[PDB]
Specification:
part of a larger assembly; 2 chains; A: 662 residues; alpha+beta; five-stranded mixed beta sheet; four-stranded antiparallel beta sheet; 13 strands; 42% helix; B: 411 residues; mainly alpha; two-stranded antiparallel ribbon; two-stranded antiparallel sheet; 4 strands; 55% helix; Large tegument protein deneddylase (chain A); viral release from host cell (chain B); Capsid vertex component 2 (chain B); capsid protein (chain B); virion (chain B)
Amino acid sequence: IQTFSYGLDFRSQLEKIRDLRTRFAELAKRRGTRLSNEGVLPNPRKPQATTSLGAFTRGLNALERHVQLGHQYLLNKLNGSSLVYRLEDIPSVLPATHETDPALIMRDRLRRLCFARHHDTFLEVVDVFGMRQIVTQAGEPIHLVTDYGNVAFKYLALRDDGRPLAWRRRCSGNVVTTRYKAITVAVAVCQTLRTFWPQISQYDLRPYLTQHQSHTHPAETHTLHNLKLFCYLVSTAWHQRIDTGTVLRLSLQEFCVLIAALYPEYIYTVLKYPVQMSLPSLTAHLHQDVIHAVVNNTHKMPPDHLPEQVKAFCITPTQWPAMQLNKLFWENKLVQQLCQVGPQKSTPPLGKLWLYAMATLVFPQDMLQCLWLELKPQYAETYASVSELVQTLFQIFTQQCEMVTEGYTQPQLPTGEPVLQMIRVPRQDTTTTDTNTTTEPGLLDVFIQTETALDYALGSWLFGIPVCLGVHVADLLKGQRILVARHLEYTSRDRDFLRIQRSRDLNLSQLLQDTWTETPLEHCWLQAQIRRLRDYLRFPTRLEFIPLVIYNAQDHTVVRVLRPPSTFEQDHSRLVLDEAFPTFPLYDQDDAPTPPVPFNRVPVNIQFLRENPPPIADTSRTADSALVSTAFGGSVFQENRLGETPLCRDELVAVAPGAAST
Amino acid sequence: VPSYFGITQNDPFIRFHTDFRGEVVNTMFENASTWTFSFGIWYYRLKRGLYTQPRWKRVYHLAQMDNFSISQELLLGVVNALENVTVYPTYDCVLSDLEAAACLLAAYGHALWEGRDPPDSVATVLGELPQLLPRLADDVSREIAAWEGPVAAGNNYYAYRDSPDLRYYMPLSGGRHYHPGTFDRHVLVRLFHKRGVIQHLPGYGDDVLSLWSRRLLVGKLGPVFVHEQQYLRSGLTCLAGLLLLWKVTNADSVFAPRTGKFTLADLLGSDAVAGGGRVRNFEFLVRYYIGPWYARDPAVTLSQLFPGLALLAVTESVRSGWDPSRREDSKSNPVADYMFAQSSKQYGDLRRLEVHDALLFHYEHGLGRLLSVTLPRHRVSTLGSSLFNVNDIYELLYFLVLGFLPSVAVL
């Protein structure tokens, strides 16, 4: 039984044990001495002759109890999961890998003790086989009654030793992408414009032009003058074009925000070139068709126009019902069943945390670093790398459960095993009736309730499921239309998204051999779970590639989840910009046309707002302070070229270095 | 065996043996009835002008006067004349245009190529066009903004100093000499020369471009410098056209809600479309018109690829009021004169070349204005919708590729 010679055939062990007792009882009756079940189990170290017949009765009872409880545990695990249907589907592990570390085995038992579904009283003994173990009051071995529930959840317990990570040190291998940088630069400015519009609108632009005197106004007034003159010029551009189904009225501030969001090039354009130079080009370059396309985006996602042409798209909330993407990624019944094992019932489901653990362990490190630097949460802002959250939360999980010991007067259980020690697990959760009712939540407590776009992105990458992430700017027209900026959109046609599916390593056997704890049944069940998960992840269920996600910018929290309806109609909106604060008269330009301005530079730094107003009528500044929109539109993620030195898994796939900043 | 053209966003590549334009047109007027079909109203005015002349009425077989239908051979003649607009055997086109544009962009982007793997083939440069176009656009736009109109700046482009007396594309003295300053107003010569791409130019104001052109072309030919022959003009004109097309087409997406009644399914039938991503618009055109069509026939030039824009350029230059003869110092249909010359062999080769080069000069003169205006795509779309029934960009791509856009009147 210790050598696992017979394998998973619990039956043959059962009947040979019954036959063993049959011969035993034959001999017992032949001797004429009654059998006594009060004896202790025989010790292989002790002489065989001194051991009594009743000792062998109790030993055979222990062996049977172990085998049928193993069979029943296997049956319960089969009943609790639909991934496997019948017992013979699991193959026997091989006993070729035979290593037993007593300290590691004891530590594995101690860590697994904290995985009990409720708080329970455990007691440490030596089994009938001669090995130290811990059992419950019913005699359940710890490795049988308690299971980690995941191969990685059991790997991480044995992984935390000394330094946080050694694989990263073995590989021996701070970069933000241009898309996220541009998104933040645009969104912060747009929300700042929306918030303090009464103050900027009251600023008087006329004196600056009429005086023809420059740089008199203070340094802080650079930004306010730039922004108001900016969307003033936007309004002047709008006025001329309209000279050449519902009617929509947009306030001046809202048109400022919309046009600023559509092209990030305008803000750099105003600073780079004078107002008189820009005005004809600004008026002519804009138009009506794309603005109507943006404002009337409905039943269509990802948007028809490429990222280079369009940056934000509007959504009507009433047309799009509510979807629950939690069921798709983590709240699924199978994931919740796998994560159900926990220290106590009051602990939340660990589907989200297990999904993050999957993302950390399976996906390449460089991709994880880049995605974390992009979608860094506010609560996790204190932590740097991706594995830090997992390590910290596992440390907290270890910290919830403590140890207290209490003696037991009877040295033996009714089963007859000698009780060396008894360990009691205190329920140390802060749920005592302090009558205060108010306390500071822990990182786990605020972590479970709050959902992030990083969660959805990791689920999309792991499960091979599409998702569209949209930054929320504001809600318009009394909520009739919603401002959504283009941040991240998944489609099978995208090369990076089809490449990252195969970039991850679905081979999870290393998580099996690297945590061998001399438990064959658990190893076989974990192998079952790994192969079934590999089959599930290799084939991703498709839903016509139409999930949409709206998340906040400041706190990185998901705001709304949408879904397009089947029926569609052309809105045929008529956009009329109301005029209550008109434009100042044009000067010395009416009664060769000026050259156009380049709409090909998206600013990356914020220092431009501090700069001087443009003089009326550097190449390094153009190249560095602002970035080209064409490379912005292209897929950011790429793969590093192979070299003579074998690249790591994380070094093989990397974000393009030219666009991003290191 | 069959060549593949897959420019369409919503359709895979069409498989054909030869004569893609001819086969497509034949299927157009054979599979579907063309009685209710109608092209642009400018086609209808050309129809009236052809009918009123009896000899060319019999040549072109224009039976009825009122209906908007256009005979198939007339469209074939339009397309083939537009093809011949550029193609030249004067230099026997030893060096086709696309290669000239590739070289001119190559010498400018050689600094850009230093970061990535250095290419040694023309096809590699063609594959880098999606990567090379953004920097080229940024630099041409910044140099456009820096333009103060020092030289005569009615419209910024090229060839605003060619002598009115000279009416032929190629310089007369063996193709070497030039009237000094013919290209001073070329905006991109002011760009490259400032960047040092073309260090020396006769009549203006080593040459790593010349060395590179020789080095890559000697293997394929088994070389003509910028100052040597006409190689100068063709590359500049075709690359300017390419940049204009890129800016116009990538300004809007093709998935715009359909407003016209013209669909390829109605053209080829439901069976044909039934039998037969989401990136920049040119990336669908590249590995169908740029690479495999080049492999099939390297000698093909820009006019053959995109005959649709020629009519728009001709119309725009007509609208400007400028004439090839006057050059700022009568007939308003430059398209039909070459047709008349080609119809009968009694026309002299010298006269045919003369009128063909006049039409060509008018063609680049029209090309200049679309890229000289702050609203290129605007003017192109507004003119094309009115004069060719171009209702959508999904239709504009078909028109520019094929040179025509049939449509049931529905009026």
